[PDB]
Design an enzyme around this catalytic site. Structure first.
Site: not given
Ligand SMILES: CCOC(=O)Nc1nc2cc3nc(NC)[nH]c3cc2c(=O)[nH]1
Ligand SMILES: [Cl-]
Ligand SMILES: [Zn+2]
Ligand SMILES: CCOC(=O)Nc1nc2cc3nc(NC)[nH]c3cc2c(=O)[nH]1
Ligand SMILES: [Cl-]
Ligand SMILES: [Zn+2]
Lengths: 372, 372
Positions: B93, B95, B145, B269, B307, B309, B312, B338
């Site tokens: 991600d 940051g 972002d 994720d 499952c 895994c 289990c 699991h």
């Molecule tokens: C995975 C890469 O995401 C980023 O770099 N920026 C970003 N991350 C988010 C993480 C989020 N987690 C949730 N809910 C648990 N909503 C999210 C939104 C963003 C997002 O707009 N932008």
């Molecule tokens: Cl999350």
């Molecule tokens: Zn399992």
């Protein structure tokens, strides 16, 4: 099929022996180190990982298991082996030591010990201890004893040892009166007598008259220090039957194990590799290291330069340092696997050196490098 | 040898797609679920165990890694893959989300975000974010972002989205100016615009003009609820290029994933399977269970009846209940393995049902049983 119990000595050097214990659930190579399963888990390891490190047998804590999840409950679920997923031998302690070290309140009597849990009133006696160990499905059952505090006066050591010997007879009779347990498990007696040679002799004589499958040297590693522990072992181990295993519970550091084998001990257990692993101490052939130290933050070498364990094949000191500093579960997992593997590699080197008649040289070389 | 990046769609049903992303470090089957590696570990699992559950790619948190152990340090040690022992693709991600959710103090500007750690002053900008992701050796790099808080007024959502699009261009240029990163990694852009269709369209147009290897729907799963998230996905996903992967970060519960795939999402994720596993929640095809509950104390069945895994196959609910009640590390390990395996089995069933043209029926059958 394997017998209920057969101990065979394949090679000897001085007082040290190497051999095997055959039991229904597997073979135990001696001298043996038993990883400690506190409450039905060797902390931070799957049983397959415990086995992969070389362990032939693990220890279970009766005091903890009777409180959580409960002995009768484990029996209803099929026994400790199927409950935790370890199908090889398990030695269970009697509860007589942990009840006195871990309970908040205790009342001792000739009948046994009543106590309050840290988590209700509970009871332990020779009969109840043997019964709990049966309900768990233990392979090696320990007689219910009393570990005399150190230091002990001769009078108090004698009184404590005498009670332990009466309890050893009650343990023997309880075990023998349960047909399934007598046919499938083994029973070990525990020598007491503090640091006093005459009491140790009286205790050994009492245990040999009762008769056990193996004999433990109890009452040590309770604050007396290595010099005194070794001095007591010097005269105590020869008092036990030569043809049965000799067990030193709660020991110990690598050098404690080496010197105890030099004095005739065949079996060991200790929380040191698991507990201190979780706390960041890693064992190496050049002595222990504290992986939390800043000097390891960029060290790409494995925990130990010769160790064959899976942790040392793959991950660096730097990575494990990060995990432990961060409080990550994987840090506990990796440190514990390495430390238990190190202990098993120590036992393997001990066994192989006795088999080749070079154990004295191994002990000297080990100490020179470990303490350099 | 595999390309830097190739996304291929093998089958489609409505808006749902199944296919593969080929990258230098491996193939990613889509729709894909990425277990979350917070600080260079998927909590409580060795990387081999993560792979054994079926994961093709994991996520790493830039915010945490830049603070501990540090991005430059990881680079000096050979990169995140060798540091943690995962040799397959890693998405990092940017940051930009965690800096705002997890820092104690932040100062936002057109340049980026300055912040104080919970563990010193630190800085994140599009350029620094791309650089950190390069130092980690990320395979899929995320544009830096701003995740607009929910609810957002149209004015604030627009201003935030506009800044994010300027940052997307800066992210693109930083990535392209680093030859080794441009040749070996991929770069994804992130759509913003809160719940507003016109802003979502402007954001999609801006990202497509810049050009990315994949496109994420940002700004969701921040308190709006599933109905509103699905309503926004309904119009937002069709705005993205059809021929590139569609990524919904931070999602989610099993039913969130199914409905998002029905709306054209290819990648996910979430910390839910790992974090809630450590807290005692186990996913089953009949819905989640809380293993701490007393009803499981003597339940010999596995966590889930179907499952496949390793947890289990071997251990009972009763055993895992005991471990979690006792606070044992092995409880966290088994619950996490699991849950991650369950999530991967969900993704496999989704992929296979799309390939066979029966995903609509799978989604209906899944929801009827999971919520029964
Ligand atoms: C995975 C890469 O995401 C980023 O770099 N920026 C970003 N991350 C988010 C993480 C989020 N987690 C949730 N809910 C648990 N909503 C999210 C939104 C963003 C997002 O707009 N932008
Ligand atoms: Cl999350
Ligand atoms: Zn399992
Ligand atoms: C292992 C079986 O032992 C028992 O049932 N009783 C017993 N346990 C002990 C545990 C000990 N741990 C240490 N040091 C860490 N010293 C110990 C002594 C005994 C003992 O005398 N008797
Ligand atoms: Cl111990
Ligand atoms: Zn090792």
């Amino acid at each position: 099929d394997r017998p209920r119990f057969s101990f065979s000595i394949a090679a000897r050097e001085g007082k040290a022996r190497t051999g095997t214990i055959e039991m229904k659930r597997g073979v135990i190579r001696t001298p043996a180190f038993m990883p400690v399963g506190t409450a039905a888990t060797v902390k931070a390891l799957k049983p397959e990982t415990v086995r992969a490190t070389g362990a032939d047998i693990i220890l279970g804590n009766t005091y903890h298991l009777m409180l959580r999840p409960g002995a009768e409950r484990i029996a209803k679920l099929g026994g400790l082996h199927s409950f935790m997923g370890w199908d090889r031998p398990i030695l269970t302690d009697s509860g007589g030591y942990q009840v006195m070290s871990l309970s908040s309140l205790t009342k001792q009597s000739e009948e046994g010990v009543t106590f309050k849990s840290h988590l209700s009133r509970h009871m332990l006696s020779p009969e109840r201890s043997i019964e709990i160990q049966h309900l768990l499905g233990s392979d090696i059952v320990m007689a219910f004893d009393e570990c005399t505090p150190y230091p002990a006066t001769p009078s108090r050591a004698a009184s404590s040892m005498e009670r332990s010997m009466r309890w050893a007879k009650r343990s023997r009779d309880a075990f023998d009166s349960r047909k399934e347990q007598a046919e499938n498990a083994a029973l070990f007696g525990i020598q007491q007598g503090s640091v006093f040679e005459n009491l140790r002799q009286q205790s050994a004589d009492a245990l040999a008259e009762i008769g056990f499958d193996g004999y433990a040297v109890g009452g040590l590693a309770v604050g007396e220090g290595q010099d005194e522990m070794f001095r007591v072992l010097d005269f105590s181990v020869p008092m036990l039957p030569d043809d049965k295993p000799h067990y030193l519970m709660g020991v110990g550091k690598p050098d404690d194990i080496v010197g105890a084998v030099e004095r005739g001990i065949d079996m060991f257990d200790c929380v040191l590799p698991t507990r201190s692993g979780r706390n960041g101490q890693a064992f190496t052939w050049d002595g222990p290291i504290n992986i939390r130290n800043a000097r390891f933050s960029e060290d790409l070498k494995p925990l130990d330069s010769e160790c064959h364990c899976a942790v040392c094949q793959k991950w660096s000191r730097a990575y494990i340092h990060h995990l432990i500093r961060a409080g990550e579960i994987l840090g506990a997992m990796l440190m514990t696997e390495h430390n238990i593997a190190f202990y098993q590699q120590l036992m393997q080197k001990i066994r192989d050196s006795i088999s080749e008649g070079r154990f004295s040289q191994f002990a000297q070389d080990f100490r020179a490098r470990y303490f350099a």
